[PDB]
């Protein structure tokens, strides 16, 4: 059932596992994410970026998730606004029925970030909705994180410890500041969020290139860094790129191998399966499998 | 809003125009169809095959359409089960919120076709749902059609007048029996349905071939035959193949021109536009534009 984001992440926080936060932009992605959670007996964070919401319509985004929740009413599900850019955007998500909203003001100075975050928190908490904020761009200041969390009363925090959104994360070898993660965790004692957490698994890379795609030397967060992140206190692991590559790899493959194929189901049933499997493996990696 | 299929088709019947019946299998197809209906001020018949319902789940098929209707509440919309093959399938569609159901028993002899159709009609009319049936494979016997409609109470009839499904309709020159259509129309005085009515326009074919697609010498119903069909009494024009070809053309196109592209919206926003334009033009051709 559809629940406050903090309901899910407080449990992950206390028990020391990570919950994948999986972006979707249409029915096929959403269906595959839900089937993965059902098969791995794992809670789900479902997130939609502002762009995904513009594409679907916020009414469709919420509506499709509510249908999927009724289909799998035993799975805890949070519906999360990913990288909300304005108070008004977070407010619209709250009104539409999102159960978690992220406000990204990390590009502002501390005082302005804190002020905007606090305003979102007041609004969202009055409506029973949980709030994520971000600190750091470059890396988080743990004492700043400590005061930020206490002052804003935000539910979870994304501290910058060395990740970038999308492919092409690291200018070489993957590096994450785990001692800084541990300090943030110690001082804030709340669920923490990792952005830019796609790993680009080798099998997903191989299916994408074998289908003719070009990943342009992208580097994901290695699996061991994700596991060490969770050990350091990460409880929400934002995952988008991995899903998109796996999905479009299969779409490209169908197009290549049958130039007369125009039944959408023939493109998107294998795409769903590939996406579903990435999610299932990620739920096992992060420790959310069998936590229902 | 969401209305009984007969509400839309009775108006078309009485005023002598055709309403396109457009199949969907996911959100992108449904969104494009609805934007077309909104931009051409046209009533909408939205169709889901049994395969599409299995792919989406009938709860999602109905759910997404209801969301779309609330987004465009000035548009009359019927949600129609396309080629229901059993009573139980039609009954499940009625229970899920479909407003029109088609039972295809045209492969049975007249007596068994009529018996199953009448059983579906009694169930669906008790629930306020309209019913379509089919006669002919062999082209329709107009005198059978007259008795069939009188005895079954079915709301609209698909008579076989020379069309098959999907691509590869005519292995030569297009040809439809308009004399037999006019007779069926005169004897039944109900809305009539044309199955296998995709035209495969030249521009859609070209886009698909331009993107490396292979249409294997497929040929559709020419626009002038579709217009002569509506002149003869066709009021519902089943359209599916044209939508898929135009959609997948743009998908293949995006895959070909950028091997690093894996943002789903970059594949499906141009796909939606190409599908919307096919639908808009078809609505103009059939005479449903500006009938809202
Ligand atoms: Na987020
Ligand atoms: Na039909
Ligand atoms: Zn992010
Ligand atoms: Zn971020
Ligand atoms: Zn048909
Ligand atoms: Zn048929």
UniProtKB/Swiss-Prot annotation, chains A, B:
EC number: 4.1.2.13
The keyword rRNA processing belongs to this UniProt entry's keyword annotation: no
Binding site for dihydroxyacetone phosphate: 166, 196-198, 238-241
PROSITE patterns listed in its UniProt record: ALDOLASE_CLASS_II_1, ALDOLASE_CLASS_II_2
Residue numbers binding Zn(2+) 2: 104, 134
Cofactor note: Binds 2 Zn(2+) ions per subunit. One is catalytic and the other provides a structural contribution.
Catalysed reaction, written as an equation: beta-D-fructose 1,6-bisphosphate = D-glyceraldehyde 3-phosphate + dihydroxyacetone phosphate
UniProt pathway: Carbohydrate degradation; glycolysis; D-glyceraldehyde 3-phosphate and glycerone phosphate from D-glucose: step 4/4
Signal peptide annotation: none
SUPFAM superfamilies: Aldolase
Keywords from the UniProt entry: Glycolysis, Lyase, Metal-binding, Zinc
Any GO BP: fructose 1,6-bisphosphate metabolic process
Gene3D superfamilies in alphabetical order: Aldolase class I
Cofactor needs: Zn(2+)
Pfam family, any one: F_bP_aldolase
Residues the entry annotates as binding Zn(2+) 1: 83, 165, 195
Binding sites annotated in the UniProt record for D-glyceraldehyde 3-phosphate: 49
GO terms of molecular function: fructose-bisphosphate aldolase activity; zinc ion binding
SS bonds (residue pairs): none
Annotated family: Belongs to the class II fructose-bisphosphate aldolase family.
Entry function: Catalyzes the aldol condensation of dihydroxyacetone phosphate (DHAP or glycerone-phosphate) with glyceraldehyde 3-phosphate (G3P) to form fructose 1,6-bisphosphate (FBP) in gluconeogenesis and the reverse reaction in glycolysis.
Protein name per Swiss-Prot or TrEMBL: Fructose-bisphosphate aldolase
Phylogenetic lineage: Bacteria, Pseudomonadati, Campylobacterota, Epsilonproteobacteria, Campylobacterales
């Amino acid at each position: 059932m559809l629940v406050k984001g903090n309901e899910i992440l407080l449990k992950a926080h206390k028990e020391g596992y990570g919950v994948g936060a999986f972006n979707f932009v249409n029915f096929e992605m959403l269906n595959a994410i839900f089937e993965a959670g059902n098969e791995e007996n794992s809670p789900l964070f479902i997130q939609a970026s502002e762009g995904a919401i513009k594409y679907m319509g916020i009414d469709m985004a919420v509506g499709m998730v509510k249908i999927m929740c009724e289909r799998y009413p035993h799975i805890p599900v949070a519906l999360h606004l990913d990288h909300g850019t304005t108070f008004e955007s977070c407010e619209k998500a709250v009104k539409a029925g999102f159960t978690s909203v992220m406000i990204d003001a990390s590009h502002h100075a501390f005082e302005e970030n804190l002020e905007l975050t606090s305003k979102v928190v007041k609004m969202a908490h009055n409506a029973g909705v949980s709030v994520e904020a971000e600190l750091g761009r470059v890396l988080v200041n743990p004492k700043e994180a400590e005061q930020f969390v206490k002052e804003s009363q935000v539910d979870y925090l994304a501290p910058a410890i060395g990740t970038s959104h999308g492919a092409f994360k690291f200018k070489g070898e993957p590096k994450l500041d785990f001692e800084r993660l541990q300090e943030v965790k110690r001082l804030t004692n709340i669920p923490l969020v990792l952005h830019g957490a796609s790993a680009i698994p080798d099998n997903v890379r191989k299916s994408y290139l074998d289908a003719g795609g070009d990943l342009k030397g992208s580097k994901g967060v290695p699996f061991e860094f994700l596991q060490e992140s969770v050990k350091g206190g990460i409880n929400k692991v934002n995952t988008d790129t991995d899903l998109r590559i796996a999905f479009i790899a299969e779409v490209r493959k169908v197009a290549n191998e049958d130039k007369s194929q125009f039944d959408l189901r023939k493109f998107f049933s294998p795409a769903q399966l590939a996406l579903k499997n990435v999610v299932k493996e990620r739920m096992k990696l992060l420790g959310s499998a069998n936590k229902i």
